Structure formats: C-alpha cells, structure tokens
Write a protein that binds this DNA or RNA. Structure first.
Ligand SMILES: Cc1cn([C@H]2C=C[C@@H](COP(=O)(O)OP(=O)(O)OP(=O)(O)O)O2)c(=O)[nH]c1=O
Ligand SMILES: [Mg+2]
Ligand SMILES: [Mg+2]
Lengths: 555, 412
DNA sequence: CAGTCCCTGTTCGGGCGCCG
DNA sequence: AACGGCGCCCGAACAGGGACTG
C-alpha cells in the first residue's frame, strides 16, 4: 500500500512480443555495497521504492558513481536491455538554451529540483517491469529484491517523462504570472522578472510552494539569489554573461584522444571567443584509427594551437538580447575554407560568436562557402532569437550579383550590406558568354584504357597547333581535365576551348577557386592568368568540327 | 453524433517520426494562439512523450492575406495511408476542369473540424510546437477531428461534401466542382461577372451549414506551353552550329526523326568558333525539316493514372524559369515557362517557391495529382527559406538536383 | 541493351565538447 | 559500465549518372 503522488502518471508500454529484462548482476566492490543499501531503505520508507518477492521473474544490474562536486552519491540503473524492449519516446527537448537569447531582467533566480527523477511516479502497470536485487554482502545474504515506483536514472524514458511532467505543473503558475519568464531545462529552473528584488522573492516563494504541492523540493543548497549565477555552464551577470573557465590540457606528447578533447573544447569556446580555428588540429585526426597513438604536432597545427591559447588569455564576455534593437551578423574569412562571425546589436558588444569551416564538395569557391556560412548563421539565429539578423558580408554587391544571376542553381542571401574588411570575397575568373573573336580555338579531348590505366590527352587548333601527351595510371575524366590543362598552358591570354566532357565542363563552369584535386587547382591557376576564356561543349562521337579530329589522336 | 470512419496505415509501415524544425518568433506566436483556440474548441488535445509519432508544423499567409494559417507537413503521414485516399474512398477527377474559362479555389478545410477522428488514429496526427531559445520543452498536441492537410480528411468528408454540394450542382449542371485536400475547385465558362456571382452563391450555400471569404482565380484555358524552338539567325558561325547540333542531338531523345547529317557537314575541319558558315542548300532543308518535327506532337505520350508525376525546373536567368512534367523520361505531358514572378531579379528562392506552387496547382487541375519536384537548389538553401514564401495549404514531394546547363534546351 | 568504372553526392554512427 | 538533448569533424556504406565495353 503506497500513496499515489499528485503528479499524473504517464502510461508506458513495451514493444509487442517482448518481455522484461532478465540480466544477472555485476560483481562490484564493497564500497558500492555500503552506498546503496542505505538508499534502497530510505526510498522504501519514503514510498519511492517497494519490495517484491518471487512473483517478479525479472532482474537488472545497477551501479553508482560520485556526484560531480558533491558528497552525495548518484545511483544509475543499467537499463540497456530494458531500453531495447521499451517503447520509443518522442523527446520534447528540442535543443539547448543559450544565454545570448536571454533578455535583460532586473531580478534573476536559479532553482534546482532536488531528487528530480525520484519525485515523478512511474506508470502503475509498468512498475512490475523494473525488478532488481540488492545483496547486503557480496557472497552471503541473498538480499531482498525491490522495485521502482518513480523514474529510475538510466532508463531511456526517464528524461522525457520528467520534462513533460514538469511542464504540466508549471502551466498553471505561468498562466497566473504571465510577465515572469521561466526557462525550464531538465530540473534546473531559470526564473527572471522585471519586478523589484523584494517582490521577486515573493513570487519565488510562491513558486517554491506551488511546486511543493506535487512533491517537488527546491532545497537551499542549489538556490541562487545573487549573481554570478551558474546556469547551463555559463556565468550570468546582471548585464553580461561568459562561459565558465575553459582549461586546455598541455601535454608534452600528443595522442589522438587528447586532440579530440582539445578540438571539442575549442568548438565549445568558439561561441564567445572570436577567431578560433580547428582546421590544422582536426587535420591530424585523419587516417589513423588508434585512440592511443602518439601524433606529432605539425608546424601548422602548432601555430594554430599557439594562436588559440593567446585568444583564451584575455577575458571575453557576451551581452543579452534586446528585442528593441536589430540583430547584426558580420562574417570574416580566416582562409583555408575557414570563416568566423560575430552576432551583436551594439557595436563591439557581441551576443555570441562562431565559426563555419565545413568543406563540402570536391570543388568550391569562397562565394559558395560564404553562402553556406550565412545559412548556418540564419538557422542558428532563428533557434536562439527567432529572427534572421541583417548581415555584413566581405563581398561586393556587384560580386554577389554576378554570381547568383549567372549560376544555374537557385541561391540567395537575406538582407545584407557590404563591409570593406579584407580579405574580400571575389570571383577569381569569369568564363565568357560568347566565343572570342581572334582567339585561337582549341579542340581538346582525352581517353584512357580501363584495364592498363594508360591514356592520352591533347588538342588541335584552327591555326594548326597540336599536341598529344601519353599518360600513365589515369582515367578518362583525368585525361579530359588534362586536355583542358594543356590547352590553357599552350594558349595566349585569350582562348576558346571546345570539349565533349560534361564532367570537366561541369567543374569549371561553377568557377571554383579551390579543389581537393591538384590537377583542378592547376587548371584554376591557369584560368586566373588568362584574360578571356570561352568554354564550349559538343556531343562526343558525332563528327562535329575539330572534336572529330582530336578524337582520332587520343584514341 | 457521427461514427468515426476507421482509418488504418498501410501494412508494414509505422507512423511518422519527423523532427520539428525551428520556427520564427511571429510563427510561434501565431501557432500558440491558433492551438489555444483549437484546444478550447476541442479540435486538438495536449499529449505526452508516450506518443512516439510527430509531424512538423508551421504557419503561412495566403496571397493577399494578413491572417496566419496553421499548416502541418503531413507529407509523411499521407504516403503512409495511401491505400485509403486512393483505393477505398477515392475522389474522381473531372477532365473538364482544365477546359473551363475560369476556376476559383476555395479553402474549405475548416469544415473538416466538425467530423471526429478515429480514436485509434489520433496518435498519428501528433505535432510539436517549439519554443524560442528552447525556453520551454515542446508543446505537443494531437488532432481530435479531421486535420487540415491530411489526404484522408477530404475522403471521409466526401460523403458529407456531396450532400452540401448537391443542391448547387442541380441548380447549375454546367459548373464543374473538384475537391483536392483542403481546397475546392469551381470551374465555369461563365463570364467573370457571372462567375464570381455564382461563386458567392456557393459560399452562402456553405455558410448555411475562417478562409471561406477568399477565392484564388485561375484560367486554365489561357495556360500556355513552351515547345522546343530553334534560333533563327541571318548568319551562322561555327559556335552557333555546334550549339545547334548539340541541341538537336539531345532533342533526338524526344523526336526520333531529327537529323543532323547536313548540319554537321558544315563543321568539317578544325575551324575557329567565330568563323561565319553559310548554310548550304541541304542544310537549309534539314533545319527546316527539324523545325516542323518540333511542332508535331510526340508519339505515344499519354497520362497514366497509376504513375507518379515528376516535375523538373530550370533556372534560365533574368526571371525566367522553365519546367517539364512527365511520368516517363522524354515523354513530357506538359512543358512551360514562367517569367516575372514575385522576387524576380532579386530572390531565387521566392521565385522557385512560386514556380513550385504554380506547377502543383496546374497538376491538380489537369490530373488531380501533385508531382514530385526535382529542384535546382542546394538542400540546405531550400530548407532554410522555402517556408518563408510558401502560400499553399498543400506541400508536394521534392528532391534536389545539380545539372549544369551543358546546352540550353528549353530557353535559347 | 546490361554491367562495370569513375566520380561526387548524402546519410549515419562514433569521437569529442557541453547540459541535466 | 547508464539515459536524453544540441553542436563539431571524421570515415565507412550507399546512391546515382556519364561513359565505356561485352
Ligand atoms: C547529471 C545527470 C542528471 N540526470 C538527471 C537526473 C536528475 C536530473 C538532474 O540531476 P541532478 O540535479 O544533478 O541531481 P538531482 O537528481 O536533481 O538531485 P539533486 O542533487 O539536485 O538534489 O537529471 C541524469 O539522469 N544523469 C546525469 O548524469
Ligand atoms: Mg537537481
Ligand atoms: Mg572526349
């Protein structure tokens, strides 16, 4: 006979055709034995755990670990076999709150529900599916077996049930106090208002007693009444915020797992520290698949690491969101496909910063990457503030106009303005729209054997110029690119090039300025040196113009 | 007082599990206000995390409208109940709707809120309202009545809709009425004055039983086609003839009688692209013969009701967009071109959004289906902006391609 | 006409950061 | 040695289209 808590239960089923968990216990140390027998007894008197007998043919092992910066221990149930047989839940936690999205509030209070999962009841018809034995001695007493009447920590349904139950309890309080902001994340509650400090504690006590009606305790141990508030791993001050101090490890020898933690902390630090790069550090995490393997720091990865430590020296901070002012986002090019940006409302008062260094596609240009960076900033800004910021981009209006009007794919940038801060983003070469009068016309072609990997590449021109080059260990696509490379090498500043290669034409028409292919980078280098280049396409194997002639040479 | 028509998913398929995407502030404030009223009216009810299903939701504003409309992306749920709205209780498509001089589209989806939904099926209509900056967790609901945007709603309501439209169809035997999703297509050959008057009679016919006051007008009789045309120049260069032969060679995949023998003979040698080539007597004959074949209709091109529709769109630049609708490759059922749409010369995504809506509307009028689009855009670009410009109560299927224009085929 | 190749694209799961 | 959430950078597995060979 256990009392039913005021919190409405959540009906939980299992996947059809499957039963409950039947896993043997794990032999642990005697330190954990004298730290859980007292918990199962305290929870038994408080109604959070009931005892069962032989009528429950299930079992599940459990372990315990010390709480972070606390004397109290934490009990975790290894429900990995129960999670495989429990119904799927839709998580109502859609993201992580960010302090840059918080508005200015005169009074702030941070709460923390004590015994979160242990204060929300489990489904009535589901408590029988949580059986676990507790041996008082490691090999003597058989130990009486208990069950769970609340949410066990470790079950894959515990977070979603708590987050949903917490919302239903706060709904009547938020309706009675519309002007009060309550950021609800897991058990920690961020409460803020523009009321006076005296009247603010009044509503806080009203909320503490409102939650007490459902068995939710807000102890004074984790009650925060004055700044700086520690919330979501940040330091919340009345007019600014900053991330909690980030410590980077400094080992003499660097392994793989050390860099993974290093790059991870830099990604977490890049949200407020401007100018963080991880290109050359992550470049060391390629190929090798041994987490315990020493990797020497390259000269580029060491200079990148030294420049990041000097950024973390000076203290930085962010501000809060004011809905009366506009949102501004400004991007800079860091080179090598790296981009950094800052979001602010007043100049030099950054709400947050960030970086976009993703390299998508084998061939791309700076305009494409800048477009992708704008899109990442837009989606990020809608999550945090629900609106798109006005952009300040290091690209001329004319440069962007030329790109998107002549591109074959739909592309667009929201309302933005040009900011003259080098390095500016530009198009390094422009393909002509019509054939060049007076320019030598090069008919290029390439062919390779699928078996021997041997091939040829060359050209013929209207003036009689001709070249054929044998190639070893190549492909048809490489010979077509090499043919275009030969025509650019052996032509004047203006040249017309005719090819049958849809592959080569598709790469060059997109005006790439960087490529993972050395051959393409050489083609780009030639295209930049030219003054006028016209690329035309004809279907192969049709007796068309000089393409029929150069086809005989390379095959 | 109505028995819930039983609805079952297609065998072997589970309910939709699609993540909600971020929403702007104005759209969340609109959905919170709309869902609160619907909850007070019992149309929806709050649910918990024991419902593993979820469907995205956002809001739109129709053309020349300032009122927010809730829109659910039931695309996943629709193709998981396809045996219902196509086999058991289907809606016949009138072949004369596309022949009418004027066709008005009426939003009648609000009528679906009067019929209850099968209790065993309500768990699949689950959706989640997000919060700004993740202040509060997701606010999940589920539908207690027939939801708007679900292909099963017009099917179940069809028996009710026929009784409402019966006195009006008897009163006017010439007016064609088609129902697709939340919309009602009313086509008539009457003049614009007589048409809109008869439309208002139908509105009053529905009132005696929040977007019923709107009426988007169409003119399917004025719908044009964009055939393949060849350039006509006084002088031709090597580059011109090379582009022409390349265009005709690709066109041979459609019209098998197109020849390029006499035109390719003009390019014998290794000539400069800008060299002018006078057309021979045979080349003029062959080019004239090919211009007539492009006017002739393609052989064996008809609509198969069992095959999905596919729509490809090409960005031609300067506000020009071309498209083709087909079921089998090179068997186009319709080719067209759009120009000077909203966002021309300033916004590609808005134009592309408008083009998708126009094409879908035409496909509903002509065949009663929505085509699956092949969009010339990057997935991340489209998924960032398309909801900002969507003005329709349905959503078609789409995929993303990248086909560089090797030869300008549909617009010289 | 099939069956491959070459190439480039996306999807996904795991590594790390961080929150509870 | 647990659960859920979001982010990044990584590689293996997979899909799809030109192009060549039997
Ligand atoms: C940190 C952590 C947390 N949780 C779940 C359980 C309760 C809530 C909050 O945990 P907590 O605040 O640290 O401990 P809690 O149970 O609330 O007890 P108190 O220390 O607050 O009194 O999240 C979890 O399942 N695993 C974890 O590692
Ligand atoms: Mg707590
Ligand atoms: Mg070739």
């Amino acid at each position: 006979m256990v009392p039913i808590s005021p919190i409405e239960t959540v009906p939980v089923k299992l996947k059809p055709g499957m039963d409950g968990p039947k896993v043997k216990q794990w032999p642990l140390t005697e330190e954990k034995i004298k730290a859980l027998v007292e918990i199962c007894t305290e929870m038994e008197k408080e109604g959070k755990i009931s005892k069962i007998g032989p009528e429950n043919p299930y079992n599940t092992p459990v372990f315990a670990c010390k709480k972070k910066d606390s004397t109290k221990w934490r009990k975790l149930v290894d429900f990995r076999e129960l999670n495989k047989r429990t119904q799927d839940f839709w998580e109502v936690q859609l993201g992580i709150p960010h302090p840059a999205g918080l508005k200015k509030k005169k009074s702030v209070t941070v709460l923390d529900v004590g015994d979160a999962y242990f204060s929300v009841p489990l489904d009535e018809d589901f408590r029988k599916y949580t059986a676990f034995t507790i041996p008082s001695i490691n090999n003597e007493t058989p130990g009486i077996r208990y069950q769970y009447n609340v949410l066990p920590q470790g079950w894959k349904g515990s977070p979603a049930i708590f987050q949903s139950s917490m919302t239903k309890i706060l709904e009547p309080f938020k309706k009675q106090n519309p002007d009060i902001v309550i950021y609800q994340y897991m058990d920690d509650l961020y409460v803020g208002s523009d009321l006076e400090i005296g009247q603010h504690r009044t509503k806080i006590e009203e909320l503490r007693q409102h939650l007490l009606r459902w068995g939710l305790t807000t102890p004074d141990k984790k009650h925060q009444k004055e700044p700086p508030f520690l919330w979501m791993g940040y330091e919340l001050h009345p007019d600014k915020w900053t991330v909690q101090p980030i410590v980077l490890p400094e080992k003499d020898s660097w392994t793989v797992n050390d860099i993974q933690k290093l790059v991870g902390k830099l990604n977490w630090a890049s949200q407020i520290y401007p100018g963080i790069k991880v290109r050359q550090l992550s470049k060391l995490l390629r190929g090798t698949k041994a987490l315990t393997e020493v990797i020497p720091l390259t000269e580029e990865a060491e200079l990148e690491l030294a420049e990041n430590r000097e950024i973390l020296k000076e203290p930085v901070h962010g501000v809060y969101y004011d809905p009366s002012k506009d949102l501004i986002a400004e991007i800079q090019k860091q080179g090598q496909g790296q981009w950094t940006y800052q979001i602010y409302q007043e100049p030099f008062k950054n709400l947050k910063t960030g970086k976009y260094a993703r390299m998508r596609g084998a061939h791309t240009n700076d305009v494409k990457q800048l477009t992708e960076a704008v899109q990442k900033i837009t989606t990020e800004s809608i999550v945090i503030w629900g609106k798109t910021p006005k952009f300040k981009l290091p690209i001329q209006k004319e440069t962007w106009e030329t790109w998107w009007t002549e591109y074959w794919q739909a592309t667009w940038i929201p309302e933005w303005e040009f900011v003259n801060t080098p390095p500016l983003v530009k198009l390094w070469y422009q393909l002509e729209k019509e054939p060049i009068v007076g320019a030598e016309t090069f008919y290029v072609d390439g062919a390779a054997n699928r078996e021997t990997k041997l091939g040829k590449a060359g050209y013929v021109t209207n003036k009689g110029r001709q070249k054929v080059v044998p190639l070893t260990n190549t492909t048809n696509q490489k010979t077509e690119l090499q043919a275009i490379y030969l025509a650019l090498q052996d032509s004047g500043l203006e040249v017309n090039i005719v090819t049958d290669s849809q592959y080569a034409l598709g790469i060059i028409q997109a005006q790439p300025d960087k490529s993972e292919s050395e051959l393409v980078n050489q083609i780009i280098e030639q295209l930049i040196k030219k003054e006028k280049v016209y690329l035309a396409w004809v279907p192969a194997h049709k007796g068309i113009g000089g393409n029929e002639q150069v086809d005989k040479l390379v095959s | 007082p109505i028995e819930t028509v039983p609805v079952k998913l297609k065998p072997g398929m589970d309910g939709p599990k699609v993540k909600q995407w971020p929403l702007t502030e104005e759209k969340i404030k609109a959905l919170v206000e709309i869902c609160t009223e619907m909850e007070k009216e019992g149309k929806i009810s709050k649910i918990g995390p024991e419902n593993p299903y979820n469907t995205p939701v956002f809001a739109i504003k129709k053309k020349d409208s300032t009122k927010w409309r809730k829109l659910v992306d039931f695309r996943e749920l629709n193709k998981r109940t396809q045996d219902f709205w196509e086999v058991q209780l289907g809606i016949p498509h009138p072949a004369g709707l596309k022949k009418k001089k004027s066709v008005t589209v009426l939003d009648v989806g609000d009528a679906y809120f009067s019929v209850p939904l099968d209790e065993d099926f309500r768990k699949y209509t689950a959706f989640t309202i997000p919060s700004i900056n993740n202040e509060t967790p997701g606010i999940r609901y589920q539908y207690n009545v027939l939801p708007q945007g679900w292909k099963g709603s017009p099917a179940i309501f069809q028996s009710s809709m026929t009784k409402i439209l019966e006195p009006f169809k008897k009163q006017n035997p010439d007016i064609v009425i088609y129902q697709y999703m939340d919309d009602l297509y009313v086509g008539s050959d009457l003049e614009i004055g007589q048409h809109r008057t008869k439309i208002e009679e139908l509105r009053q016919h529905l009132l005696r039983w929040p977007f019923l006051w709107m009426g988007y007008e169409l003119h399917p009789d004025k719908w044009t086609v964009q055939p393949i045309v060849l350039p006509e120049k006084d002088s031709w260069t090597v580059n011109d003839i090379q582009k022409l032969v390349g265009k005709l060679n690709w066109a041979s995949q459609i019209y098998p009688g197109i020849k390029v023998r006499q035109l390719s003979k003009l390019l014998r040698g290794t000539k400069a692209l800008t060299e002018v080539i006078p057309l021979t007597e045979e080349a003029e004959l062959e080019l004239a013969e090919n211009r007539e074949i492009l006017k002739e209709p393609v052989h064996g091109v008809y609509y198969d009701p069992s095959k999905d529709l596919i729509a490809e769109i090409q960005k031609q630049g300067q506000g020009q967009w071309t498209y083709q609708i087909y079921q089998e490759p090179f068997k186009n059922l319709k080719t067209g071109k759009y120009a000077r749409m909203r966002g021309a010369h300033t916004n590609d995504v808005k134009q592309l959004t408008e083009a998708v809506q126009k094409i879908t509307t035409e496909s509903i009028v002509i065949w009663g289906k929505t085509p699956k689009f092949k969009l010339p855009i990057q997935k991340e670009t489209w998924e960032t902006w398309w909801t900002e410009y969507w003005q329709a109560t349905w959503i078609p299927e789409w995929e993303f391609v990248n086909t560089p224009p090797l030869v300008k085929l549909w617009y010289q």
